[PDB]
Design a protein around this ligand. Structure first.
Ligand SMILES: COC(=O)[C@H]1[C@@H](OC(=O)c2ccccc2)C[C@@H]2CC[C@H]1N2C
Lengths: 219, 220
């Protein structure tokens, strides 16, 4: 049977530098004289897109910065210079004119850029939600790098826990940054029990933690 | 040139069966046939198998025997993927593809299938008002909180598509209630909070819910 394993699983490469991805086949795919290795690129929320077919030929509408090499069992996909729009997952694919097909496990590619601090904002609950019995307080961290970030909620300066959730956007294909949203959910009752709601952010782009807050009733 | 459109997202309970469609822009699928690919949330691509366009003879990959069936409804150059006795492990996005040559590779945008016992439920849309607390420099941030819905997905656009710059719609989080929640925000000129109107358009097909929430400024 044929299995393809890719190296590495993840890779972070500086904008403008070279990205090298590998794929090894459990057995030779060049015995017929042709190199049956293909490469696909897939960005979040989109279907795969062919980049290279037959180990080294560029697919349709693929910039020359992408290239491929190898034969037998070892192949590599090369990107140079890496651009922000290249943040994606890359898969090698084995197959002849007709199937079967065998995909490799994939290689996530993150674009590395200069550190950037997040812009922090906070949103007190809306009147209509409060009216329905709950209170959601949202904290937004906009356009930052690297992805590593820490958000702490404090109600009347008391660190909250187990009552908040967050999601980070995929790396921006334009400027290579991230954005994060954190939601502190509380019952109307609980919410009206306290006065100060704050979001405290720590990111290697901030000299010292930044805090955003408001007082219930102020807004 | 060619383009495959697939049927929308589906919600089924375990044990049920689901049937997804793939339609070409051309008048039929090429001589090479058609392929189906599976992608579980956050996982890799996995070839399911293929079906011959002429012989209608399907071939299934090892890990996809018994419960899966590829069918050709040539009646309108359409192909179908059927899965019976749905399990949790079937929760994934299914892609259909076909090719006429090395340079002619066409993919469908995939059909997201969700296997769960949870009931469908439209979201509530709450405004994330811009104010002194969501302003920095000349930029003001504002948004919409789409809370308590099931199943995925939800789409959000701003001012019917007019505003798209600086828009950030985050990945939905699954709350302890088993319901999803998501937020969509946008940064717009602080002064343009007296010259412009801002409305988020939320669409949650699974429950046929369409909401338009105008987001107004808050003084404090
Ligand atoms: C002609 O076959 C293809 O188009 C295949 C592939 O090419 C070949 O396998 C191939 C074999 C012999 C000659 C030319 C191309 C490129 C991509 C990946 C699978 C499939 N295509 C979508």
């Amino acid at each position: 049977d044929l299995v393809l394993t890719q190296s590495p699983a993840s890779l972070a490469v500086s904008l403008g530098q070279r990205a090298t991805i590998s794929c090894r086949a459990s057995k030779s795919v060049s015995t017929s004289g042709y190199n049956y290795m293909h490469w696909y690129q897939q960005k979040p929320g989109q279907p795969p897109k062919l980049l290279i077919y037959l180990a080294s030929n560029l697919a349709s509408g693929v910039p020359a910065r992408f290239s491929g090499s190898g034969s037998g069992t070892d192949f590599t996909l090369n990107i140079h210079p890496v651009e922000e729009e290249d943040a994606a997952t890359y898969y090698c694919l084995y197959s002849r004119e007709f199937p079967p097909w065998t995909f490799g496990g994939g290689t996530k590619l993150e674009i590395k850029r200069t550190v950037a601090a997040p812009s922090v904002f906070i949103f007190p609950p809306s009147d209509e939600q409060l009216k329905s019995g709950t209170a959601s307080v949202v904290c937004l961290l906009n356009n930052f790098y690297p992805r590593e970030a820490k958000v702490q909620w404090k109600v009347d300066n008391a660190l909250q826990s187990g009552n908040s959730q967050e999601s980070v956007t995929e790396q921006d294909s334009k400027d290579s940054t991230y954005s994060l949203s954190s939601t502190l959910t509380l019952s109307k009752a609980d919410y009206e029990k306290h006065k100060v709601y704050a979001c405290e952010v720590t990111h290697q782009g901030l000299s010292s933690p930044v805090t955003k807050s408001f007082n219930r009733g102020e807004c | 040139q060619v383009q495959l459109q697939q049927s929308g997202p589906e919600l089924k309970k375990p044990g049920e069966t689901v049937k997804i469609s793939c339609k070409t822009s051309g008048y039929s699928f090429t001589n090479y046939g058609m392929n189906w690919v599976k992608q579980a949330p956050g996982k890799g691509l996995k070839w399911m198998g293929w079906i011959n366009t002429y012989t209608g003879e399907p071939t299934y990959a090892d890990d996809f025997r018994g419960r899966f069936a590829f069918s050709l409804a040539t009646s309108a150059s359409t192909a179908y993927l059927q899965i019976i006795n749905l399990k949790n492990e079937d929760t994934a996005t299914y892609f259909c593809e076909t090719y006429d040559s090395p340079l002619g590779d066409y993919w469908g945008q995939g059909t997201t299938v969700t296997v769960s016992s949870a009931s469908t439920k439209g979201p509530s849309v709450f405004p994330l008002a811009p104010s002194s607390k969501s302003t920095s420099g000349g930029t003001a941030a504002l948004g919409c909180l789409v809370k308590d819905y099931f199943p995925e997905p939800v789409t959000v656009s701003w001012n019917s598509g007019a505003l798209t710059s600086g828009v950030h719609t985050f990945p939905a989080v699954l709350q302890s209630s088993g319901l999803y929640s998501l937020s969509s925000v946008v940064t717009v000129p602080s002064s343009s909070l007296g010259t412009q109107t801002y409305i988020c358009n939320v669409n949650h097909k699974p429950s046929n819910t369409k909401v338009d929430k105008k987001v107004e400024p808050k003084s404090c």
